Design an enzyme around this catalytic site. Structure first.
Site, short mmCIF file in Angstrom:
data_model
loop_
_atom_site.label_atom_id
_atom_site.label_comp_id
_atom_site.label_asym_id
_atom_site.label_seq_id
_atom_site.Cartn_x
_atom_site.Cartn_y
_atom_site.Cartn_z
N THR A 10 0.62 -1.40 -0.10
CA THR A 10 -0.18 0.05 0.03
C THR A 10 0.73 1.07 -0.08
OG1 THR A 10 -1.52 -1.48 1.51
CG2 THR A 10 -1.72 1.49 1.38
C1 LIG Z 1 1.57 -1.70 2.80
C2 LIG Z 1 0.64 -3.23 3.29
S1 LIG Z 1 1.55 -3.67 1.95
O1 LIG Z 1 1.20 -5.50 2.99
O2 LIG Z 1 0.90 -3.77 1.14
N1 LIG Z 1 2.69 -4.15 1.71
C3 LIG Z 1 3.35 -5.16 0.55
C4 LIG Z 1 4.39 -4.22 0.50
N2 LIG Z 1 5.86 -3.61 1.45
C5 LIG Z 1 6.41 -3.00 0.62
C6 LIG Z 1 7.05 -2.54 1.34
C7 LIG Z 1 7.49 -0.60 1.76
C8 LIG Z 1 8.18 -0.30 2.83
C9 LIG Z 1 8.98 -0.62 3.74
O3 LIG Z 1 9.24 0.27 4.92
C10 LIG Z 1 10.63 0.21 4.72
F1 LIG Z 1 11.45 0.46 3.00
F2 LIG Z 1 11.24 -1.34 5.19
F3 LIG Z 1 11.41 1.07 5.50
C11 LIG Z 1 8.87 -1.78 3.84
C12 LIG Z 1 7.97 -2.79 2.55
C13 LIG Z 1 4.82 -3.56 2.32
C14 LIG Z 1 3.69 -3.71 2.93
#
Ligand SMILES: C=CS(=O)(=O)N1CCN(Cc2ccc(OC(F)(F)F)cc2)CC1
Ligand SMILES: C=CS(=O)(=O)N1CCN(Cc2ccc(OC(F)(F)F)cc2)CC1
Ligand SMILES: [Cl-]
Ligand SMILES: [Cl-]
Ligand SMILES: [Cl-]
Ligand code: NA
Ligand code: NA
EC number: 3.4.25.-
Lengths: 311, 320
Positions: free
Chosen positions: B1
């Site tokens: 998201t």
């Molecule tokens: C949002 C709900 S999701 O379930 O659609 N989602 C699946 C995709 N993900 C990507 C993601 C983006 C940033 C992040 O933060 C960091 F960069 F590590 F700081 C970690 C993972 C988020 C969780």
């Protein structure tokens, strides 16, 4: 739009709503009857909630969405004077809301509290010309139906009608109380008797479910099935056709005890949309969190795969 | 998201959110990014509303729905202390909500801004999350350099049970064509790998929103331009690169709200459209000019194509 609210002999409440939506709507338009917080709400008494409350809404405009109406009503009904609370909510949102010339809709509500006896206050309110309601307790054994109208001289979308009553239940059997509505909109002298009859049958189905020991959500579902099946209601059979001549239904249901929720939007080909919403809720209780909201072809396929009759 | 919130030089706010939803979800499952009150919220200052507020959410879809989190946050931000209001909401209304009492851990996040006129504009912006991490970016038109940041739960915190919260304050001159944007590229598990990529898309998303504002665009057009950039990243679960559903197919949710008009647009279970937020914005736009605010599935696709929103028919499915 049709709806129902139920309280069982323990004070557990449930609410449901079902609609065909706007006539000639663009395909895939989903309205308030499918949307969490907007179409219906049910919440047992809790920490910041002295009444178990159940709300089902009706109308058209998007004003039921824009104000998150069912949840708004449920929260307002925590005030001492329920009549005044509902009236103020209808007045602020269906006349003076910041969120149009005239706002058309209706609501049915109940709230109960333990006194072992249950005091159930039930009300209906609408800014439409008319609204057909029915209600019944397990101990009276005769469903009452009534066509609520705006007083003479009133203007739909500019005045509010509100009535209701009080019901005292014994919390020792397999009883309960149900309030239903078969729609809020233009008055029709011709089909008034048919609307009352389906509200009567819907109440009787809900009470019979309670008396067999069924959950409040199954009882409110049995009421909506009956309301859906009437060719005169804009829900299930007889739903308004969309811009392409096809039926697309919205429905949802909420359980006051578990706070669980089920909903379908833009559902075609299923005879009783509320049955799918209830099944989503029921599978949610058995359960990754199972889905609570399915739309379109995916919702149809899921309904069929779970054995819900198609049309 | 992914999400974004924007305020223009007058205090007009907008918010949007876009998601691919849960991996392997059943076809037709619609989550918080399509749902009024849940995925985003925007409301200008009014009678019983001293602040213009904008909220966009992130994380697990069903927890954000059951608590109607974006609207709850916006209402809590009417209190004097915005930091305290958001933290209490995340702790009491999200983690400890009775609506999620059956769940082991409650996973989600929000970005918020609120502004008020003190002619100058005081913008307070915050992010908060119960996930391990959340990537944010933010930018004002007068600073001219986007800042990005990966917010993490501190040592000793427990994901789904603890709250991280940070933010700041920004004062804008309300005499130009300026404004402020805060975006997020996801909230979930920390990934050192794509950390730089998430930060980079957040930076570009902020720059697109600011450039829109500086060109005189509406807050809703600027927030949409941020989300387009965020969707287009193959690394975000939104638009291109969205999680595949149980049938190996793409179904997107997205929504947008305008603080000035309080109008709203949303799409659910949308396939075959490159930028779902563009359809939500167009629904909102056509609503200003009863128009629909929420389309799903096949009808949503057909409506997008009929309004000239770029499609990929090879990504579109329509089963019978
Ligand atoms: C949002 C709900 S999701 O379930 O659609 N989602 C699946 C995709 N993900 C990507 C993601 C983006 C940033 C992040 O933060 C960091 F960069 F590590 F700081 C970690 C993972 C988020 C969780
Ligand atoms: C825009 C709303 S709708 O398209 O969902 N709908 C169209 C169909 N209507 C049937 C109906 C039912 C009861 C009623 O009350 C009376 F029986 F007269 F007392 C009046 C009309 C309800 C409103
Ligand atoms: Cl329409
Ligand atoms: Cl699923
Ligand atoms: Cl960082
Ligand atoms: Na019907
Ligand atoms: Na993406």
């Amino acid at each position: 739009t049709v709806g129902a609210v139920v309280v069982d002999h323990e004070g557990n409440v449930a609410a449901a709503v079902s609609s065909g939506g706007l006539a000639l709507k663009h395909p895939g338009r989903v309205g308030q009857a499918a949307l969490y917080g907007c179409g219906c709400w049910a919440e047992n008494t809790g920490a910041h909630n002295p009444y178990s409350t159940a709300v089902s809404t009706s109308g058209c405009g998007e004003h039921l969405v824009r104000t998150i109406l069912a949840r708004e009503c449920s929260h307002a009904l925590q005030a001492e004077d329920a009549h005044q609370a509902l009236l103020e909510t209808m007045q602020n949102k269906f006349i003076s809301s910041p969120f149009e010339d005239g706002v058309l809709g209706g609501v049915i509500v109940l709230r109960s509290c333990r006194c072992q006896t249950l005091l159930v206050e039930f009300l209906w309110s609408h800014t439409t010309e008319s609204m057909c309601v029915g209600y019944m307790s397990a101990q009276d054994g005769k469903a009452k139906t009534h066509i609520s109208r705006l007083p003479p001289g009133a203007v739909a979308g500019q005045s509010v009608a509100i009535e209701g009553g009080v019901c005292r239940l014994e919390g020792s059997g397999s009883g309960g109380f149900v309030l239903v509505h078969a729609g809020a909109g233009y008055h029709s002298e011709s089909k008034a008797k048919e609307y009352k009859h389906v509200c009567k049958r819907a109440c009787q189905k809900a009470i019979e479910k309670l008396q067999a020991g069924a959950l409040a959500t199954d009882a409110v579902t049995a009421a909506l099935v009956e309301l859906e099946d009437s060719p005169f209601t804009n829900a299930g059979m007889g739903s308004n056709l969309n811009l392409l001549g096809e039926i697309e239904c919205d429905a949802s249901i909420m359980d006051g005890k578990s706070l669980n929720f089920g909903a379908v939007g833009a559902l075609s080909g299923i005879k009783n949309p509320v049955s799918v919403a209830n099944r989503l809720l029921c599978e949610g209780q058995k359960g990754r969190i199972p889905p609570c909201f399915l739309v379109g072809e995916g919702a149809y396929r899921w309904a069929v795969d779970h054995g819900i009759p198609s049309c």
